[PDB]
Amino acid sequence: MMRVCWLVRQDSRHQRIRLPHLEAVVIGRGPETKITDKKCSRQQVQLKAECNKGYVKVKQVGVNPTSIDSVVIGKDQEVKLQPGQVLHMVNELYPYIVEFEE
């Protein structure tokens, strides 16, 4: 009954990752994202989906800047990613959005 949370690579929208409700998902450089940029950590962001409330808590784990609509989060800081917002994995590159689907 609860909506599914998808982290979608905005510029390659067939790359989708399931984000389980209230469970931490750590992603970055690797086979899931296909990011090869060495400035992106293998563990760049920690994601906690809120499937009822319709946001995803984003904690920057990597040193280099993760941003939401160009606004930098900062290492160990946490910001809520919302419908319409774009998450850039590192240095305003590699855009991701979140979608909530039945």
* CATH number for the domain that contains residue 6: 2.60.200.20
Structure tokens that stand for 56 in this block? 């995803």
- As beta bridge partners, residue 48 has 24, 57
Instruction: Cite the beta strand spans of the chain per DSSP E.
Output: 4-9, 16-18, 24-27, 45-50, 55-60, 67-68, 71-72, 78-81, 87-90, 93-101
Documented resolution in Å: 1.6
Give the whole-angstrom CA distance, residue 27 versus residue 64.
Answer: 14
Q: Which residue has the tokens 């240095």?
A: 91
Structure tokens that stand for 87 in this block? 């998450």
How many CA atoms does the CB half-sphere of 13 hold within 13 Å?
4
Structure tokens that stand for 8 in this block? 């979608």
Give the whole-angstrom CA distance, residue 83 versus residue 100.
Answer: 9
Give the whole-angstrom CA distance, residue 66 versus residue 58.
Answer: 9
- Number of domains, the chain: 1
Q: How far is CA 14 from the centre of its chain?
A: 15
Task: Note down the domain range covering 4.
Answer: 1-102
Q: 49: which residues sit within 8 A by CB, 6+ positions away? A: 5, 19, 20, 21, 22, 23, 25, 56, 57, 98
How many CA atoms does the CB half-sphere of 5 hold within 13 Å?
25
For the chain, report the end-to-end CA distance as a whole number of angstroms: 8
